[PDB]
Design a protein around this ligand. Structure first.
Ligand SMILES: C=COC(=O)N1CCc2c(sc(NC(=O)Cc3cccs3)c2C(=O)OC2CCCC2)C1
Ligand SMILES: [Zn+2]
Ligand SMILES: [Zn+2]
Length: 327
């Protein structure tokens, strides 16, 4: 049946539930369809198609349309980053401390929010978009420009021919899913980070647990804050991956940043915070970024789900000392 390529692909996909799936191999084996194949795999794996009556050809058609609205000419914020965050969100949902906590609708909404979360990303920043006085910035009034755009595009794509994967959800299911997907994606904006991180801490502070090992989340605010933190954790999971992956990701985001620095030079604009080709030390930037943003976030999350995130925290801590070695 399968081509031998499909077979090689299938064996790699046997790792979808493991942290550090080789997402870059999967992109190669798949003809640059990492997003399509990982989503499909997860959806079958989690039985999402039957539970929500999603016709499989519609699912495929939409996945492929979604992936083609990621830019192949963008080093980091592309389909592979999309697939990576989706699969990471998928692993985090399986964490033992959230066993049987979230409904299928909420799972569906977290995975879907991951898949569309950066779609149509240009490879430059909100501030850049605001400074260039770009259309996108005028539309969204300089407020969460890219993140508002990813949502509008992710949803509009469901209207293309044979693309409505939510065609069989009730109005009720659709309105709740939508709101969940909008809260999750707007929370990927980095300027929400501290606020998001603070609530997580407060969650951990006042943390309750009941009847067997399972977190007690009994109102919307609490349930959505967790999902929001989960996906935002997945968005910032590169330095917790095995170093081979992490280094490939660091390569890509640095390429994107310098290329924006270039576009800022090519327009007299002033330079971005360490987007400086020629003048910015990657090794240092990684270390501070871990100590100030990535470690605190993941340290809290580890707290929340203690101790299922131990190896994760540990890898991050190693990758951090490894970047220090590089002075
Ligand atoms: C103090 C707040 O600053 C702040 O949030 N930003 C500046 C730095 C930075 C992001 S996102 C990101 N990277 C990721 O979202 C995913 C990763 C890809 C490879 C490692 S991590 C980096 C970064 O990693 O590097 C920067 C730090 C200073 C120079 C660039 C946004
Ligand atoms: Zn983003
Ligand atoms: Zn992202």
């Amino acid at each position: 049946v399968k081509t031998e390529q499909e077979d090689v692909l299938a064996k790699e996909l046997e790792d979808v539930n493991k942290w550090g799936l080789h997402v870059f191999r999967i992109a190669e084996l798949s003809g640059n369809r990492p997003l399509t194949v990982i989503m499909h795999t997860i959806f079958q794996e989690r039985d999402l198609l039957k539970t929500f009556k999603i016709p499989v050809d519609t699912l495929i058609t939409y996945l492929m349309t979604l992936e083609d609205h990621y830019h192949a000419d963008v080093a980091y914020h592309n389909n592979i980053h999309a697939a990576d965050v989706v699969q990471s969100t998928h692993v985090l949902l399986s964490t033992p401390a959230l066993e049987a906590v979230f409904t299928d609708l909420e799972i569906l909404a977290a995975i879907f929010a991951s898949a569309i979360h950066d779609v149509d990303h240009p490879g430059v920043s909100n501030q850049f978009l605001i400074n260039t006085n770009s259309e996108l910035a005028l539309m969204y009034n300089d407020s969460s420009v890219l993140e508002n755009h990813h949502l509008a595009v992710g949803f509009k794509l469901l209207q293309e021919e044979n693309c409505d994967i939510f065609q069989n959800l009730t109005k009720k299911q659709r309105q709740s899913l939508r709101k969940m997907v909008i809260d999750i994606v707007l929370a990927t904006d980095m300027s929400k980070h501290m606020n998001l991180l603070a609530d997580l801490k407060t969650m951990v502070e006042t943390k309750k647990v009941t009847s067997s090992g399972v977190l007690l989340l009994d109102n919307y605010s609490d349930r959505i804050q967790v999902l929001q933190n989960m996906v935002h954790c997945a968005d910032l999971s590169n330095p917790t991956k095995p170093l081979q992956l992490y280094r490939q990701w660091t390569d890509r985001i640095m390429e994107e940043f310098f290329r924006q620095g270039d576009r800022e030079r090519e327009r007299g604009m002033e330079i971005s915070p360490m987007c400086d080709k020629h003048n910015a030390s990657v090794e240092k930037s990684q270390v501070g970024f871990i100590d100030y943003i990535v470690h605190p976030l993941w340290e809290t999350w580890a707290d929340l789900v203690h101790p299922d995130a131990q190896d994760i925290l540990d890898t991050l801590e190693d990758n951090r000392e490894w970047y220090q070695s590089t002075i």
